[PDB]
Amino acid sequence: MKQKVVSIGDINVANDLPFVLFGGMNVLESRDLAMRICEHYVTVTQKLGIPYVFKASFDKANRSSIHSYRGPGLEEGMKIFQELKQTFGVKIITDVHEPSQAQPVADVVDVIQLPAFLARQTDLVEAMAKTGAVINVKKPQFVSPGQMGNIVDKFKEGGNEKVILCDRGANFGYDNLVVDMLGFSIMKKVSGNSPVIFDVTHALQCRDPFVAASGGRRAQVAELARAGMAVGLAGLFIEAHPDPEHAKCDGPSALPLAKLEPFLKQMKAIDDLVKGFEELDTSK
């Protein structure tokens, strides 16, 4: 059939409708740090005809604590969004965490997001449904693609149908991740022919680490993000930074802010002749 289509303003994600870029950076650091990162993506998108959704997050919770650089806090967090917002009037995105705060957040951001870790949490499916915004079910590393029609189900069941599926890779043996390009469709088909997207930072993150032959970073984001794009994704998802990120030069991987442009020119041209490619199939 044709692919379902959750519509974001002039942008429309869909599996035969170009890789929309849910670009961005990680932890919402400086109301103005953003800007280097916010503004810089925006230019390029346009130069290439890539649509753009800026990604930013208002919190921490995952890893180190007792405050340890926990991020902006909904209150002060949500302001910074509202700035770069009209500054260059663009589509943003944010992951809630614990129900309540699932509405305020859902006013500055265009595409809310549910953390891989709480996917099977119900009360947030529920508490993101008694909303009606664009949801981005971030896929858990321990869920076979084929269970995603079970995060989607209850979403619609919660009133909310506007869903998106972001794949990040599954774990491979202790501390490692992988991505099977064959998981995409599988997710595509259980998810009412819904839109499927590749998150390469949080993915490649551990994929590069297979210590012995690792024990110390190294990146190939475009080399792995080409694989996804070369199969047929609704979109791509990446985070950037000049000096890899205070939040990405320690946690996951990270895209070199100024290295962005030609990466996309790869992703645009590669993708290019795929959404083109007239539907083929080899089950006969």
Q: How far apart are CA 191 and CA 234, in angstroms?
A: 13
State yes or no: is 272 an active-site residue. Answer: no
Experimental technique of record: X-ray
b/e per residue 183-212 (b: at least 16 CB within 10 A): bbebbbbbbeebbbbbbbbbbbbbbbbeee
Residue from 26, 85, 110, 139 carrying the catalytic annotation: 26
Token look-up 């970073």 returns 217
HEC-encoded secondary structure of the chain: CCCCCCEECCEECECCECCEEEEEEEECCCCCHHHHHHHHHHHHHHHHCCCEEEEEECCCCCCCCCCCCCCCCHHHHHHHHHHHHHHCCCEEECECCCHHHHCCHHHHCCEEEECHHHHHHCHHHHHHHCCCCEEEEECCCCCCHHHCHHHHHHHHHCCCCCEEEEECCEECCCCCEECCCCHHHHHHHHCCCCCEEEECHHHHHHHCCCCCCCCCCCCCHHHHHHHHHCCCCCEEECCEECCCCCCCCCCCCCEEHHHHHHHHHHHHHHHHHHHCCCCCCCCC
What type of residue is 127?
A
The neighbour count for residue 69, using CB atoms within 10 Å, is 11
Q: What's the token pair of residue 209? A: 């680490």
73 - beta bridge partners? none
Q: What's the token pair of residue 251? A: 């946690």
State yes or no: is 26 an active-site residue. Answer: yes
So what's the architecture of 1-284 in CATH? Alpha-Beta Barrel (3.20)
Residue 170's φ and ψ, nearest 5 degrees, are -110, 165
State yes or no: is 175 an active-site residue. Answer: no
Integer-rounded Cα radius of gyration of the chain: 18
Residue from 60, 139, 162, 248 carrying the catalytic annotation: 60
Cα 205 to its chain centre, rounded Å, is 14
Question: Shortest CA distance to 139 belongs to which of 207, 186, 78, 70?
Answer: 186
Residue 12's φ and ψ, nearest 5 degrees, are -140, 115
What type of residue is 169?
G
Token look-up 């079970």 returns 150
Residue from 107, 123, 243, 250 carrying the catalytic annotation: 250
Residue 221's φ and ψ, nearest 5 degrees, are -65, -50
Resolution in A: 2.8
Q: How far apart are CA 237 and CA 166, in angstroms?
A: 8
Residues 6+ positions from 253 with CB-CB distance below 8 Å: 200, 201, 202, 204, 205, 208, 217, 219, 221
